[PDB]
């Protein structure tokens, strides 16, 4: 199976206080491993996974400095983006930064990304080649021109195609027990009839990782979405993930509806009918 | 590992 490392950073401005709330978190695939919180007592990068605890003072002092700076970088950006957009200092605004890399089965680089949104709309995103920039607003254009003049694209393509991948590998290995295990979905159906006219069949999937998954309903063996509910895939807090999907069926046709499960942990796709 | 280059103001 494939893998990614990604860092998510979030700066929200609290009017009347020149110090915003900063929250940075590091994922390797669907597994959190580090976090920073401008509010928390420590003001150091904190570990979350076991395997990242075996890094030494060098690692933490450095990751603490970098992410403190990411925060101070955002502190300013809010200052700027008010001018650039002409908005009130009375308003609380949001900057979000997300970067990381992908790798195939082979652990060889596949894709890098570095994206930025002001108030949860795209601002400036790095194109796939990692040499170009996509700006929407002329505010982004003014960034683009300043970021080309500090060779940012070049500067990141180094991290993303290089460092990002060199440490994703380090993590994947150093943390094999955590990260390279693939927990398969425990599946079943429930049948609660809503009347004597209809029946609701619910295809369940529990205690699985990674969070990627696909549940699909087939009436006489054809993909149905017409009467199909399908919940957002959700955590449990033990590091596994859950999802269900249901169809409403004319009672006496339960056996014509089958559920199709797909996951990395699954050797073959599962088929479910009513029992 | 966090980025230690690429990150500046806008």
């Amino acid at each position, epitope marked *: 199976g494939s893998h990614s490392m990604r860092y998510f950073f979030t700066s929200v401005s609290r009017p009347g206080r020149g110090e915003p709330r900063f929250i940075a978190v590091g994922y390797v695939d669907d597994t959190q491993f580090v976090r920073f919180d401008s509010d928390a007592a420590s003001q150091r990068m904190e570990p979350r996974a076991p395997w990242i605890e075996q890094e030494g003072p060098e690692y933490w002092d*450095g990751e*603490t400095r970098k992410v403190k700076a990411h925060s101070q970088t955002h502190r300013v950006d809010l200052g700027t983006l008010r001018g650039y957009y002409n908005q009130s200092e009375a308003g609380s605004h949001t900057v979000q930064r997300m970067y990381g890399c992908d790798v195939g089965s082979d652990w060889r680089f596949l894709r890098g990304y570095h994206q930025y949104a002001y108030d949860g709309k795209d601002y400036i995103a790095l194109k796939e080649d990692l040499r170009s920039w996509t700006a929407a607003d002329m505010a982004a254009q003014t960034t683009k021109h300043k970021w080309e003049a*500090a*060779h940012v694209a070049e500067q990141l393509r*180094a*991290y993303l195609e*290089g460092t990002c991948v060199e440490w994703l590998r380090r993590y994947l290995e150093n943390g094999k027990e955590t990260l390279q295990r693939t927990d398969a979905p425990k599946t079943h159906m429930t049948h609660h009839a809503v009347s004597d006219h209809e029946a609701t069949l619910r295809c369940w999937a529990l205690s699985f990782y990674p969070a990627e998954i696909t549940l699909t309903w087939q009436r006489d063996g054809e993909d149905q979405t017409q009467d199909t509910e399908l919940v957002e895939t959700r955590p449990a807090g033990d590091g596994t993930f859950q999802k269900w999907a249901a169809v409403v069926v004319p009672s006496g046709q339960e056996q014509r509806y089958t559920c199709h499960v797909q996951h990395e942990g699954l050797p073959k796709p599962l088929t479910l009918r009513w029992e | 590992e966090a980025a230690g280059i*690429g990150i*500046l103001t806008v």
Partner: T-cell receptor
Amino acid sequence: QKEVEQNSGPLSVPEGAIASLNCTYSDRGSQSFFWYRQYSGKSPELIMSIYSNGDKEDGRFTAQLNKASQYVSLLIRDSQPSDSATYLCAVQKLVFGTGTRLLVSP
Amino acid sequence: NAGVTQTPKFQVLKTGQSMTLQCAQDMNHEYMSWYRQDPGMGLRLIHYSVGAGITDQGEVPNGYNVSRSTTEDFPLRLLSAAPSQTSVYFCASSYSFTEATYEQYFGPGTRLTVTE
């Protein structure tokens, strides 16, 4: 202090020959590398900075990085004697080595 | 304005004396730092702002307090002066940490001698 290790001179080259200055850093996953030039009695001065494997060319100065071997270097092709001064090596504009005192003897 | 500034340029001191070195830069530099350099050794980091109000300790922080009111100033103070502190102190700012292009300008340095 191991953080960043330098030649630790004095090094002495003849005029018009290439100077090679060498640096290794302890903290792996440093990603910025800077070369500073301090004349005796004066203050450090950024001359070169590399963030990416290979050779970066700036006139007579070339700077070299091998993130494999945790190594940074500096070529001064065609040394003049006004080049003679302490050269300081630095990771993420934060920690510096002792410095390598270069004497380009004319 | 003139990159980065320092006061004084040269200072004698009696062991066990209060003393502050000034540092200033009108460039909007969030990152700043303080170094000591002894003839022979090189730059050893004492403290560093990554921004206003944020300060961290470096490699040789003993003897030496620091402060970070305002983006502009980054003072350095010796509470009880010692010969062990007789050195050349440089103060450096860059627009950006976590970014290579932007230069790290150095002050003219303060040359400090402390005598019993």
